[PDB]
Symmetry: D2
Subunit: 255 residues, 4 copies
């Protein structure tokens, strides 16, 4: 079934994760035809500034995420940044996320594959759609069974990303495709007004899921604030994508 | 508001080709009564890559052939001009005057189209940012245009490739009705050397995206036998596939419409 | 010999043209190994705003340019925008300039070629280097003998142009290559600090000439003000490009 | 200030290859005494497109082979790290620690390199704007780096293509010494499918442009027989051509130097 990955960008506190986890659990009950996956980063390892929020560490992170998986029975997903983090993270994360800048780091992908968990690779902003074929092959080589590719925009001049929707059907040839509705409209080094419109485009085109970051108070997010979707808007957007998908799916091309 | 479907052969290869496509468009206009159809065909391909490629049979012949289509089928007409002097004679048959993408900044061409009293449709240049169309519309309004359209047809993305930045649809809607060009947005500029390339397998999904995002119309070239087209062959849509494509966009538009953001 | 095209962007007045013409005449006398060509537009036919300066018309324009060619004996070049302007302009213009946005308009190129004059086509910001081969062929077909291709930047995301110096050697395969040092750093819809550095790059790479706009008081230019090179800086830059060329020319690749 | 020339085989295919290239670099360092040479070679290609491409013989072997080059020829050494833990052992031989382009934003890798006391050279990511390197340098300074380099190696320009925006040289010079990567800037990312492509015919002219604009050094990969390289073959420069290229950049640099803008 259709996949919806959502949660706060960073693990600002397990308190925050439980508040978002509650709303995602609720939505999960209201939309049984959808498989929800809770997402949150235990570390922002690639901030532009040394003076920005990174997180509370992997320890506190896996701890807080475990609390969500136990308290709400929601699947879990978080990103890793170096090979050694694959094993400890695999303890709670149902899906291991590979950062976009790291989509080509062979050992990170192999370490993720080895854990036996599912792997979701964010397509680098420098990568062409067809070049993801090799990414998938590395994961298969590493023993990966559940592989996802996430579209999150492509470099378009400076401090700007454009979403080439031709990548959805192209990447679908070798993996399940997820659309990152949040970071695809962010401006490197974002504009919330384009999140919903492009989400609609992604489902009209055809994808296996949507990646969507949410926060009680977006403007207060310690990371990616100008892109955080308000918690209260999640339901409406999900209902919207399901309806569009239902009608459009009739025309999705055969693999 | 009535959705707009602009369609037709890329070039006026012959009056016969036009009448053949016109008949089908007419048939579709009878079925899809909630759609406003506009028959399109260029009397001249004035910007081919090669001096050896097909251009057309002249403005006179073209206007004559177009008039025949309007008389025989009662369809609105649209064609593009390349120099100011063509605006007047073209306005005698064209309901919508189209401005080529490379020429979207040529002040006199725009002014010439605007003073005819006809509607004007400007193809957004591959070099233009979405927010830069605000001045294009201002020029037209200044020149007297009352019905203005802006057509999205892709943006330069590296060499011989175009990308469609769907953020442009809601941006351009701030000052004009927006049209999505389903065939040229997947075209590969001069990708074939003396001719341009194209990827027909992406035409349909990108069109679905366009209507899901929200636009006021779609523009699509069609031809009985695409591979025989004298121009844009790699992008021409098989005439028999037009009905299904249209039904699909109307369905996707209906279900997505309640979510279209207010400008 | 090496070509230097210079002058004010627009014909703000024949007075302005005579003041710049005097300095270019002087430079022409000081650098005999260089062929100078006076440039100025009788109309800015593609301004973004309807409320901006266009010019005084073709009449007043050809008039003022004729005054420069007679008073200083300097060759002339100006751009045309529609086919009918080729003939009247060919009366004074030694080189007919084709605007970048119009580099693919067949009739404009043919009308220019027919006049017998030399033709300089500005490479469209949407065009690939190799795609200029066809541009040249149209001109040859039209009877052109002296054909130039000018590099003026390529679309790089929004409101930004990047100069791909690989285009110089590629275009040199079928025509003489001129480098537009002024508009190559302008931001569509500019930064003067990059004009000189990239001019140096162009000659180090290898080109047949440089296109350079100048004005007594750049900030007062009615068009392209943020890019107009100060008249007083022309000499130093020319001397600089000649010295770099002299040393680098030893390594220019064979066609 | 002494111009920097960083050169060597792309990968440590074998200690033999290294000693063969090292001998030549050593010979050149004796001739071009006004140049500071740094021998380069990766102990591991950790970001190949295909899982089937050559990677190397391990960090231990690589560091061993590099140390041999430094001992036998007295040449400075530089190699790149891929994870934080590699910084320490690599710092035992490397005079300059290189940070891969895709990893230019990985805070811990940068911090790991900085605390070794060694010089740090960051390849500017193909996704990074020139002005965005200001924070990269700040991170390094924060982590204790006293000698920092920023290397220009091209920017994403459409798919499978890189363009060099020379405006970046004077921009990055505002906060660090700038190095121009003559071989990877003309590389075609994954242009060959399971491998990347490249256009060797542009290496030389772009290098001339780099020195004419103004930089503090050039980085160039070389190999006795480029077409036999186990990686970056389409871009490796023939070892015998190194001397002439270097002489040329020194000549162009000298004549252009009086015009370099002051930062
Ligand atoms: O899902 C994610 O967490 C993330 O989008 C990573 C993203 O959160 C960060 O890259 C974030 O955009 C970045 O750290 C912001 O940097 P600034 O310091 O605000 O410029 O995955 P990616 O690898 O696609 O970037
Ligand atoms: O040499 C030229 O005159 C010109 O560079 C034309 C150039 O002067 C104009 O295009 C100018 O940049 C433009 O009119 C400025 O538009 P604004 O209205 O300031 O946005 O030739 P091109 O065809 O390469 O643009
Ligand atoms: O096939 P070439 O000659 O490149 O020209 C194609 C164009 O005519 C086509 O994209 C469209 O009709 C106008 O640009
Ligand atoms: O040839 P593939 O496998 O695409 O990788 C090439 C890269 O290793 C090369 O550009 C460089 O060594 C690092 O990116």
């Amino acid at each position: 079934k259709f996949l919806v990955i959502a949660g706060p960008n960073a693990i600002e506190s397990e308190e925050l994760l439980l508040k978002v986890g509650e709303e995602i659990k609720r939505l999960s009950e209201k939309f049984k035809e959808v498989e929800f996956v809770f997402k949150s980063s235990f570390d922002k390892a690639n901030r532009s500034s040394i003076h920005s929020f990174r997180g509370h560490g992997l320890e506190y992170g896996v701890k807080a995420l475990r609390k969500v998986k136990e308290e709400f029975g929601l699947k879990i997903t978080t990103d890793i940044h170096e090979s050694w983090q694959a094993e400890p993270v695999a303890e709670v994360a149902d899906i291991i996320q590979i950062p976009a800048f790291l989509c080509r780091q062979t050992d990170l992908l192999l370490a993720a594959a080895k854990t036996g968990r599912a792997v979701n690779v964010k397509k680098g902003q420098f990568l062409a759609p067809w070049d993801t074929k090799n990414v998938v092959e590395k994961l298969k080589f590493g023993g990966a069974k559940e592989i996802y590719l996430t579209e999150r925009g492509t470099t378009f001049g400076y401090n700007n990303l454009v979403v080439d929707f031709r990548s959805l059907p192209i990447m679908k040839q070798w993996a399940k495709v997820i659309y990152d509705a949040t970071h695809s409209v962010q401006l490197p080094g974002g504009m919330r007004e384009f999140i919903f419109p492009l989400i609609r485009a992604a489902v009209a085109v055809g994808c296996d899921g949507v990646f969507m970051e949410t926060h009680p108070e977006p403007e207060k997010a310690l990371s990616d604030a100008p892109t955080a979707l308000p918690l209260s808007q999640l339901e409406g957007i999900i209902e919207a994508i399901l309806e569009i998908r239902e009608v459009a799916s009739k025309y999705y091309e055969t693999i």
